[PDB]
């Protein structure tokens, strides 16, 4: 004698986006980070 319909809701999905690109890490691998307090880098020469 009793009736109930339902309640709705439940399933949802999400999207994800990507990171920067190919050529930013191509340029991120070619730079400097700094001198921590005081160091040197390079002073050399070769083949006479």
């Amino acid at each position: 004698q009793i009736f109930v319909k339902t309640l709705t809701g439940k399933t949802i999905t999400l999207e994800v986006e990507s990171s920067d690109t190919i050529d930013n890490v191509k340029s991120k691998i070619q730079d400097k980070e700094g001198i921590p307090p005081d160091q040197q880098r390079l002073i050399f020469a070769g083949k006479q």
């Binding site: 890490v25 070619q30 400097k32 921590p36 390079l42 050399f44 070769g46 006479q48």
Partner: protein, 426 residues
């Protein structure tokens, strides 16, 4: 290693992304990567148990137990952030081998680790000396025999643990001199060209799988091996400045042994196929479209190597003040395996170098002539002296307060027969 437990006590949050982009830091560190996370090495092998009823070996790899498509992203952390040298003459001696014969060289680096204070919870890698293995070298590259040098580096690593030394890195030269009278070298490795050759990534990545880093937060006791790769190539304008990189621990601990081989292009590598030996998944990467932007453009025959390397910073200690250097006596001794050059000698070189300088003169200049790296490997390989005298030779060279250890060294009968067998010989 005492360096791993010292950074666990200090908290430094150190994993803030907005703070490290202010100071121009690419990746944070290894220890601040630990506290944000549970340290599992990602595996790409096929399984042999599979949690189901299908057979493991022929076919039957389910989607819950399948290696997915690799997005091929760079590593977000670094093992060490800054490699530090100790003397400018150890590098000047290694480039001097190229100046005499013109061809390339190869070597292994010995050193230790300590605390780096510029980066929050960072490790710096202090090198001490350079060993040279036996090698055959061409003008384009070099590849020595595999087996006979690995037999040789067991006993010299047994010869290096009493000083507090360990193999931490490797070096290989690539100069490509232009004209030798109007400039030093060319510019072979830059942004447009390749940064690291793919034939040398397989030699760099294999050195990490055999040199494990002890970690207590892992499941197998080893994760993210600490082995640096240094190269002497040259900067952009006119010098021969060095560069130092490391391989990614998410792939190169697993993928190098099976599906990584050298191609004909120096900026890419050749992908392999197992033909039902194991399962090789698909590699996704990005490029730039001519008019717009692409999404997923290449499946099989291309992947770049520069997605897989992390950058490091080299450094040299200051001239006015330093903490310790531990190995400056001459840094001009003939090395181990410079057989192509003329510095491959015998008892005649001990007459020319020291002859226990000014035989009955003093000891202060003698301490600054016996604390050389390749000198103590040579006189111990002769094994004339007793092993307990060789332990005393270690604390008389690299350890401070050497004065009371040097007089008990020369008064023994072990040091007396070396200068007696040297005066009679040539």
């Amino acid at each position: 290693l005492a360096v791993d437990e010292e950074l666990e006590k200090e908290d430094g949050p150190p994993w803030d992304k907005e703070y490290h982009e202010k100071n121009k830091i690419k990746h944070i560190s290894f220890h601040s990567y630990l506290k944000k996370l549970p340290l599992s090495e990602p595996d790409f092998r096929i399984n042999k148990r599979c949690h189901n009823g299908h057979e493991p070996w022929p076919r039957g790899i389910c989607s819950k137990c399948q290696p997915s498509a690799i997005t091929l992203q760079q590593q977000e952390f670094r093992m060490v952030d800054h490699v530090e040298f100790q003397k400018s003459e150890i590098i000047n001696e290694f480039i001097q081998a190229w100046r005499y014969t013109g061809m390339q060289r190869f070597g292994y680096m010995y050193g230790s680790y300590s605390k780096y204070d510029n980066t929050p919870l960072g490790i710096k890698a202090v090198v001490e000396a350079i060993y040279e293995p036996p090698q055959h070298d061409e003008q384009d590259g070099l590849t020595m025999d595999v087996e006979q040098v690995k037999n040789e580096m067991l006993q010299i690593d047994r010869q290096a643990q009493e000083m507090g030394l360990s193999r931490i890195g490797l070096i290989f030269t690539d100069l490509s001199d232009a004209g030798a009278g109007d400039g030093s070298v060319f510019c072979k490795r830059h942004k447009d060209s390749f940064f690291l050759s793919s034939l040398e990534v397989i030699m760099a990545a294999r050195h990490q799988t055999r040199h494990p880093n002890v970690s207590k937060y892992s499941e197998q006791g080893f994760f993210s091996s600490k082995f640096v790769t240094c190269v002497i190539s040259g900067n952009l304008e006119g010098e021969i400045d060095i560069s130092s990189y490391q391989v990614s621990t998410e792939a190169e601990a697993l993928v190098t042994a099976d599906m990584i081989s050298g191609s004909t292009f120096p900026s890419m590598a050749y992908i392999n196929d197992t033909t039902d030996e194991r399962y090789v998944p698909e590699i996704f990467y990005m490029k730039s479209n001519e008019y717009g932007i692409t999404v997923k453009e290449n499946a099989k025959p291309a992947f770049p190597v520069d997605y897989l390397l992390v950058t490091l910073t080299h450094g040299f200690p200051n001239t006015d003040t330093e903490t310790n250097s531990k190995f400056v006596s001459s840094t001009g001794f003939p090395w181990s395996n410079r057989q192509a050059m003329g510095q491959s000698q015998d008892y005649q070189e001990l007459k020319k170098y020291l002859f226990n300088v000014a035989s009955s003169g003093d000891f202060n200049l003698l301490h600054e002539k016996i604390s050389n790296f390749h000198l103590l490997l040579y006189i111990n390989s002769l094994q004339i002296l007793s092993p307990d005298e060789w332990k005393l030779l270690i604390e008389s060279a690299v350890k401070n307060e050497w004065e009371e250890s040097l007089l008990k060294l020369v008064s023994s009968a072990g040091w007396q027969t070396l200068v007696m067998i040297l005066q009679e010989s040539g």
